[PDB]
Amino acid sequence: IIVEGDHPSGAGGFSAALLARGREAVFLRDRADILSLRIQAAKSRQCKT
Amino acid sequence: EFASSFGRPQLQTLLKDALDQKVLDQLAARYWNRPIEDLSPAPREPDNIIDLPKADPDSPYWHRQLDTACSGLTRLGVGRLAATVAASAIQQHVEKLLDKSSFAKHPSARKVISDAAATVLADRSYATSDGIEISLKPYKFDPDIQPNEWAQGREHVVGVLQAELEQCQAAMKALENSVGGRKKLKEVMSFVDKARKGEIIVEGDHPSGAGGFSAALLARGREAVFLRDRADILSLRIQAAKSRQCKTLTNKYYCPEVFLDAVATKLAQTAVLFLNVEMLNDFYVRFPREVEAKLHEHMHAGGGLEKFAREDPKVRRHLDLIRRKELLETVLGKIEELHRISSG
Amino acid sequence: MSSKLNETTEAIQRELEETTYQFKVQYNEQPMSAESYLAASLDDFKHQFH
């Protein structure tokens, strides 16, 4: 899908600001996911040396 | 056989149906909720349907409400509605009888018949309508309901209101699937409901986007909550219509539904008397004569009788065989005249 | 003016046919003088008072 950005307020269908605030949410999700992965990866034995 | 079958009770049911559609328009436009806008609602609040059973019997508001409703329903073009509806119906039953008739092939001729019935109905339409308006004059002033009819109007009203209930529920389901997921329209309902109470307030500086919701998504949600509040009002007015207090007529201003249906039915039936004599009978006398004359005018002025024969396959084979037999007979007759000449 | 006569005339009839049906829907075309109203009200007030 691709969405349009017609209704940018909050509280309602899918707003243009709701949509934007989702976009940053997913990002903070993936950056979290890669952060904790990378924490595991720095704690692995392959990084000891 | 059809005219011995149609009669009067059918015009009874058809008119009575139409007049139901009419009762629902009146009952909503005088008593129930309306469309929805953003700014929070009026109380209203003397006009809440919920306290009708426990409201003062000498309420000026309800008195004027039912009186203007009934006056209005009567001073409607019930004559024209009768004349046209019975028109569409007689037309319909004629077009269906043609369908089963010997005239299923031969489209020219079928159309000639159908247009003939139409022109006779079009002819009688006005005098039927007038006469109906003059016959209804006395019930326009005082349409007094008898208890027996009031029982009838109650049983009818229960069926018509609950059906309208299911039609509100379905328009809803079509709103839901139109908008997307039912849960989204439940989200835009929650935004409309919250704005309808005191919980949230929106000022109207940007009429493009309010909440996270499009300008149309919000319109669709207002209509959604409307349908729902109308669905709630209907189910209640069904329950109060079944209620013990509505059993008697004496509280007529308490149960407008059964009242207005009784009025609809009585008008429907007296209209149905005049309409059965004048329009229908005129139709049964005039229609065969018109069928004959327009067919005779079509077939003889158009020379389409021969094509009328060509249109059916079987009879065309029948008529085709006879020609060769002809040509050979005429030949043998010329031969005979010769043989005569050459023998004496 | 004569050539505009046929079009202007129908258009007045249209406005009139509308007014007449509004008289028909509103009030059921029942006739009314101001005097007929004041008379009815005055006859009600005179029965009430007495």
UniProtKB/Swiss-Prot annotation, chain A:
It is found in: Mitochondrion intermembrane space. Constitutes the soluble short form (S-MGM1) generated by cleavage by PCP1, which plays a central role in mitochondrial inner membrane fusion and cristae morphology. The transmembrane long form (L-MGM1) and the S-MGM1 form higher-order helical assemblies that coordinate the fusion of mitochondrial inner membranes. Inner membrane-anchored L-MGM1 molecules initiate membrane remodeling by recruiting soluble S-MGM1 to rapidly polymerize into a flexible cylindrical scaffold encaging the mitochondrial inner membrane. This is Dynamin-like GTPase MGM1, small form. It comes from Chaetomium thermophilum (strain DSM 1495 / CBS 144.50 / IMI 039719) (Thermochaetoides thermophila). The chain holds residues 766 to 814 of 939 of the full protein.
